[PDB]
Each structure stands twice: as structure tokens, then as C-alpha cells.
A paper describes a structure:
Human [name] (hDPP III), also known as [name], is a member of the M49 family of zinc dependent metallopeptidases and cleaves dipeptides sequentially from the N-terminus of various bioactive peptide substrates. Crystal structures have so far been determined for [name] from humans as well as from Saccharomyces cerevisiae. Despite the low sequence identity (36%) shared by the two proteins, both structures are very similar and consist of two lobes separated by a wide cleft. The “upper” lobe is mostly α-helical and contains the zinc binding site as well as the catalytically important residues. In both structures, two histidine residues (His-450 and His-455 in the human enzyme) and a glutamate (Glu-508) coordinate the zinc ion.
Numbering used by the authors:
A (entry chain B): 1 to 8
B (entry chain A): 2 to 726
Write the structure that this text describes.
């Protein structure tokens, strides 16, 4: 499972 | 103002910083990272085949063009052929986009993007290029094959997906959700994982569909020492439909991968790294997920290495059904300094898990003390780079044996800085606070998301004969007060049960844990936030989530009623849950910015976060875990798809707001990654300009040994499956 940052 | 399905010329490009972390590696560690990286970049090309029918051709055409002429050389030809600098820049950005996404569809959003210039103008450049002079047949051939699809924005080609209203290469073009469901039931019944598989449906003379489940492996129909995959290689009968299990998918590519994996094995630090690589080789040669599971099993026991790595068909985000895995692989240097606070979070994680809004009967049996390190990425192949990862995805390993957490430190650093003038949908009184703490806030959020989020929760599983991994007599469901009446049977996984919503559902649960546990002072103290700074981080973290919930509407498709990005759908849901609580906690207000164009504002009452937000989030978080543990997909879909519903209902009017979100949207940055070169004995690190031309150059020097060979391979694999789409 992944973790994201938005906006990027 | 950005245009849909088009990458802007001024798109942000950042080069991954990896000089210091590489300068610390020993010669053997460097050689280890060198071959692992090559294995990653090799297998990363398979993503092209896993994206679109034309993606392999496009990569082959771009690679040919830039091998003969670098961006500066090709500039001189393009500008002499009538292209403006702006039009040429649009082509450079497109090429860089294809490279960084490994396809002509965004990894984050699953939308197609096309070159922002006339097709007839690009044709003159390509046909008149140096690559075209040296090889006229294959250049004209490639342009004839992928030229039309390179620019086409017909509605059915705009988004990834099953059915006639979408594009996918995980399935043949004639496949639907019904086909994917039938396949998954077949796969579950044979205890065959879908991670390294694709599905193809061809019809006979009668019109009766025939299904082929093709596994990814070096080996094909030929016999070999293995029996686990070999015995599976036959025809089947399932509910009246004929299934056939084959292998040999991406065979020449995976061949290149196991070559570099085997070479890297000769530089392994310990037996844990040695055995895990041998098992990965077994997996990629035979097509065995178990072999990859065995490899992952050794990998977890490799606690806190110097060079961390993982590779394979890991994540199932881009599969429209949500069970098949996209190939990826990374090589990174463990930043000992930044990894200090994460191990600190692990040291108190067992007690933190108890603070979660569900009884210990719904939590894992034992705290497994997982590894958690901050990483400096040297190589992250595939379609996109995440902020953090929780792996492996095998839940039978994570609830019994263990798992790993990684925070990509040199990735967080890219979006750490903030430009006030480009902030959107934020109140002016919050902008300064947002800028100052945005960075530190997600650093905490990433830590909780992976460790306290993905690393929490137990799955109720019944084996093939009676015995439950829990005690049904004593365990009671909190929401109803009754005993457990739903669970996971043999062969059933999280992805097989919840399918299309499985990813987003879990991210929502994980993001909610992050918000919920970011209220705990001992958590913030670990990351170094106390007193006034502590509540500031909390307020910003919640302000960011609510803000992101509005931005998420970019990744929703109204005409299809379908969300395209799991994490963003998850944040929109959380936004809805906090809006549902009322009490003046969160409000969304349509406005008119200084731009003169439609705008919007987001307000968050800081004082009502703990009194209104927390109990509402606590209620919602309890429901999530309950339906997840019991595998209640019907209740899960009823709960999640409810909040995930996008409408133009007052006062928010999200469907109308979506138009404002798109109007003021900012494209995600492209990331340039470095290369490693081997001068016989010593390994050097090649770095590149933080630009489109720099990103292009990074791939031109990425495969100096067998570059033209890979173009040929990717072309061959593409043509072989052309009848499917
Ligand atoms: K999934
Ligand atoms: Mg389709």
C-alpha cells in the first residue's frame, strides 16, 4: 500500500 | 490555466537528490544498488505494456529519436522544420511525461495525455529525424502504428477502465466488469493470485467466450523443474466457461530482470538478502507468487539494512477490478538520521494501536514490531513515485509474520516548500500557517498512515475446514452487538472481496487513522512538536485534509460516476464525513478570486476539531474497520460509496465546484531520477538537469548496454497482443 502527497 | 489531457509546458520538474546517500555506500553496496537498479529499470518497462496498447510503441519511437539526437540536437532539426520553441517544448514535456509515467496515461489520475502541438508538425520532425534516416522502416512503422493513438482524445480513450468506455491492457478490449468478477472467482477457487496475471477473452465461431489467465514469467509453455506453476498450466472448466492458465508474459523483459537480480545476489550483505533475491528470481522465472511471497518473507527479516529494496507486481491501483498488480521496484539508501524518529514511533506503536476506536478482537493478535526507515531513493521504476509505502501487500504475512514501513525522505523534500501565490481554496488568515507547517504535517501523516494505518486491523479468516483465526464464541461485533456472521474464506483476499473499492476504502481507513492519532501529544513529541507548535501542526494537518477533499474532485469522472484516484477519493470521503458532523466545523464557500474567475474558500473551526471532528471521525473509523474485518462487502460498499457520491446538492454543490477545481488545478511535478554507471570496478552516480530535457536525458543513458534491444522487445510484445485491442 502506498502513501501520497497532494498537491505535489 | 491547465488543459485536461494535456501536460503544460511550465510543468514542475524536480531532480531527485541522492548525492550524499550514495557517497556513503561501500564499493560492494554500490555494486549491489547498481544491479538492483538495472533490474528495476528493466522491469519498469513492463508498465508500458500494462498501461495502453500504444504505450510500448511510443516509448520505442521516443527512445529511437533521442538516441540519435539529444533534445538540443533535435531542437535544431525541429525548429528548421517549422516548429516554434513553444511547440517543441510541448513535445519535450510529452516525452518526459511518457517516460516518468511509463505510458501515455497519468499514474495519478489514470487520464490520457497527448502532445500539445499539431500532429502534422510532429510528423515532419519524426520522419525527417536522424533516427528516421538511419532506420526509415521502423521509424515510419512506429509512427504509422502509434501516431493516431498518440493524439486521439475520443471519449473511450480518455480514462483507464474496463468496458467500452475505457482503456485497459490488464484485460482484452472486449472485457467487462462481469468478466473480471468471473475471473476472480476462478482465481480464488484455484488459490491463484491475480498479482502477476492478465485476462484475455476471445470468442469462438459460436460466439462462446474463452478466457486466458496469462501469468508473468520468463518461462513459457516449455517444461521446467517447477511443478507448482507447471501443474497449473492447463485448461479448466468454471461455471460453464473454459479457462486456460498460461505464462511467459513480458518474458524477454523479466529475463533481463533476473539477470541483474542474480548479479546483485553476488553482492548481498546477508543471507536474508541472498535468499529473498533467489526467490524473486524463482517468481519472475516460473510465475509463482508464492515464490515472491517466500522472498518477501525473508525480506521482512532483513531489519534496517543500508540499501533497502523491493520489486515485483506489488500494488493493485491501476487495475480497474483492483486485484492485478503493476510492476515496480525501488532501490534506496537508509537515512539513519531521519529514520530515528520512525523507529521511535514503532517503539510506542503497540500502545498507540490501543487508542484506535475498535476493540482488541478486531486488532492483530500480536504486535509484530515492524521495520520503519526513512529512505533516500536512488531508483524508483514504474509509473510513479509515492511519499511512503507499507509492504508487502500479502495480508497473511502482515498479520502473522511482519511487515515494513518506508518514508521516502528525499521525495517529501520536493513538495516541502510552498508558494503562497499558488495556494488554492485557502483563507488568507490560514495561508501563512499552512506554509509554515505543511511540510512537517505530512511527515507525521505519512508515519501514521503506513504504520498505524496500514499496519493495523485484523482480518477474520476461516480456513478450508471450520477453524477460525479468531474465537467466534467470544468476539462480538460492536455496531450490532451480535456475534461475527461474516468473514474471509479460503482463497479470499482484501482485493478479491472489495475489488473496485478495495484500494480507496483502505486508504480512507489509513488516512482517518492518521488524522485521529495526530491529536495524540506523544505522537507529535516523537516528531518534535510540543505546545503551541503541536496544536498548529494538528490544525494544519486537518486543514490540509479538508482542502485536499475539495481538490479531489479533479480525480472524479462525472459522466462515468467513477473515481480515478484512490487516495483522493478517500480524502473526499473524509471531507464529507466532517461536513456531515455539522456544528460549523467545515464549510465550503463558492467565491470569486482576484483573478475574476470562479473560486472557492475552505474554513475549518480549530476549536471544534476535538469536540466535533474527533467523535465524528471516531464513529466513522469504527464502522470502516468492522466491515473490513468481517469482509462485509455489501455493507462496505453501502457505507463507502455513500460518502463518495458526488452531487450538486446544496450548500456545497460539488459538481459545480469541480469545474472550479479543474480551472485552478496545478499539475503534479515530474521527477528526474539519477543513473548508476559501472566502470569495471567503480560505480559512479550520474545526475541530470531538473527539466523535461533533463528527464529525457536520464532515460537516454538509462540503458547503454542494450537500449535498441529493449525497443525491439517492447515492440515485439506489443504486436503479439494487438488483436486484443
Ligand atoms: K486494489
Ligand atoms: Mg476497456
Amino acid at each position: 500500500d502506498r502513501v501520497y502527497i497532494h498537491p505535489f | 490555466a491547465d488543459t485536461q489531457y494535456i501536460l503544460p509546458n511550465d510543468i514542475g520538474v524536480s531532480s531527485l537528490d541522492s548525492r550524499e546517500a550514495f557517497r556513503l555506500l561501500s564499493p560492494t553496496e554500490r555494486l549491489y544498488a547498481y544491479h538492483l537498479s538495472r533490474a528495476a529499470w528493466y522491469g519498469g518497462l513492463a508498465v508500458l505494456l500494462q498501461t495502453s496498447p500504444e504505450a510500448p510503441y511510443i516509448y520505442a519511437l521516443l527512445s529511437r529519436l533521442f538516441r540519435a539526437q539529444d533534445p538540443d540536437q533535435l531542437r535544431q532539426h525541429a525548429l528548421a522544420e517549422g516548429l516554434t520553441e513553444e511547440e517543441y517544448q510541448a513535445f519535450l514535456v510529452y516525452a518526459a511525461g511518457v517516460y516518468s509515467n511509463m505510458g501515455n496515461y497519468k499514474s495519478f489520475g489514470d487520464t490520457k495525455f497527448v502532445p500539445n502541438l499539431p500532429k502534422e508538425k510532429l510528423e515532419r520532425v519524426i520522419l525527417g529525424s536522424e533516427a528516421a534516416q538511419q532506420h526509415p522502416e521502423e521509424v515510419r512503422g512506429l509512427w504509422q502504428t502509434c501516431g493516431e493513438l498518440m493524439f486521439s482524445l475520443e471519449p473511450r480513450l480518455r480514462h483507464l477502465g474496463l468496458g467500452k468506455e475505457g482503456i485497459t491492457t490488464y484485460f482484452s478490449g472486449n472485457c467487462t466488469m462481469e468478466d473480471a468478477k468471473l475471473a476472480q472467482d476462478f482465481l480464488d477457487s484455484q488459490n491463484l493470485s491475480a498479482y502477476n496475471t492478465r485476462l484475455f477473452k476471445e470468442v469462438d465461431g459460436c460466439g462462446k467466450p474463452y478466457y486466458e489467465v496469462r501469468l508473468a514469467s520468463v518461462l513459457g509453455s516449455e517444461p521446467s523443474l517447477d511443478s507448482e506453476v507447471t501443474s497449473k498450466l492447463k485448461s479448466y472448466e468454471f461455471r460453464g466457461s473454459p479457462f486456460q492458465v498460461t505464462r511467459g508474459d513480458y518474458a524477454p523483459i523479466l529475463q533481463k530482470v533476473v539477470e541483474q537480480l542474480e548479479k546483485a545476489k553476488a553482492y548481498a550483505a546477508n543471507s536474508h538478502q541472498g535468499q529473498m533475491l533467489a526467490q524473486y528470481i524463482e517468481s519472475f522465472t516460473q510465475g509463482s507468487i508464492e515464490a515472491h511471497k517466500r522472498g518477501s518473507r525473508f525480506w521482512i527479516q532483513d531489519k534496517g539494512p543500508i540499501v533497502e529494496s523491493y520489486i515485483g507486481f506489488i500494488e493493485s491501483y491501476r487495475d480497474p477490478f483492483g486485484s492485478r498488480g503493476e510492476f515496480e521496484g525501488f532501490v534506496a539508501v537508509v537515512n539513519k538520521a531521519m529514520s530515528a524518529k520512525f523507529e521511535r514511533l514503532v517503539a510506542s506503536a503497540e500502545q498507540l494501536l490501543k487508542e484506535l476506536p475498535w476493540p482488541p478482537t478486531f486488532e492483530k493478535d500480536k504486535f509484530l514490531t515492524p521495520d520503519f526507515t526513512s529512505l533516500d531513493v536512488l531508483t524508483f521504476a514504474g509509473s510513479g513515485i509515492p511519499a511512503g509505502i507499507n509492504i508487502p501487500n500479502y495480508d497473511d504475512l502482515r498479520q502473522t509474520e511482519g511487515f515494513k514501513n518506508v518514508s521516502l525522505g528525499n521525495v517529501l523534500a520536493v513538495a516541502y516548500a510552498t508558494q503562497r501565490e499558488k495556494l488554492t481554496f485557502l483563507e488568507e488568515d490560514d495561508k501563512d500557517l499552512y506554509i509554515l507547517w505543511k511540510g512537517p504535517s505530512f511527515d507525521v501523516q505519512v508515519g501514521l498512515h503506513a504504520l498505524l494505518g496500514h499496519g493495523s486491523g485484523k482480518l477474520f479468516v476461516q480456513d478450508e475446514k471450520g477453524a477460525f483465526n479468531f474465537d467466534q464464541e467470544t468476539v462480538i461485533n460492536p455496531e450490532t452487538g451480535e456475534q461475527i456472521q461474516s468473514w474471509y474464506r479460503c482463497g479470499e483476499t482484501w482485493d478479491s472481496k472489495f475489488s473496485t473499492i478495495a484500494s480507496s476504502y483502505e486508504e480512507c481507513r489509513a488516512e482517518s487513522v492518521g488524522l485521529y492519532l495526530s491529536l495524540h501529544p506523544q505522537v507529535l513529541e516523537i516528531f518534535g512538536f510540543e505546545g503551541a507548535d503541536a496544536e498548529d501542526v494538528i490544525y494544519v494537518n486537518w486543514l490540509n485534509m479538508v482542502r485536499a477533499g475539495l481538490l479531489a474532485l479533479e480525480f472524479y469522472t462525472p459522466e462515468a460516476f467513477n473515481w480515478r484516484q484512490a487516495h483522493m477519493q478517500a480524502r473526499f470521503v473524509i471531507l464529507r464525513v466532517l461536513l456531515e458532523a455539522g456544528e460549523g466545523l467545515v464549510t465550503i464557500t463558492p467565491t470569486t478570486g482576484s483573478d475574476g474567475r470562479p473560486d472557492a474558500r475552505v474554513r475549518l473551526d480549530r476549536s471544534k476539531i476535538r469536540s466535533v471532528g474527533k467523535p465524528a471521525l471516531e464513529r466513522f473509523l469504527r464502522r470502516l474497520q468492522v466491515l473490513k474485518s468481517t469482509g462485509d462487502v455489501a455493507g462496505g460498499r453501502a457505507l463507502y460509496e455513500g460518502y463518495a457520491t458526488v452531487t450538486d446538492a446544496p450548500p456545497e454543490s460539488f459538481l459545480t465546484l469541480r469545474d472550479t477545481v479543474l480551472l485552478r488545478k496545478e499539475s503534479r511535478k515530474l521527477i528526474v531520477q539519477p543513473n548508476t554507471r559501472l566502470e569495471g570496478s567503480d560505480v559512479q552516480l550520474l545526475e541530470y538537469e531538473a527539466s523535461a530535457a533533463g528527464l529525457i536525458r536520464s532515460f537516454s543513458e538509462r540503458f547503454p548496454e542494450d537500449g535498441p534491444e529493449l525497443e525491439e522487445i517492447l515492440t515485439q510484445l506489443a504486436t503479439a497482443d494487438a488483436r486484443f485491442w
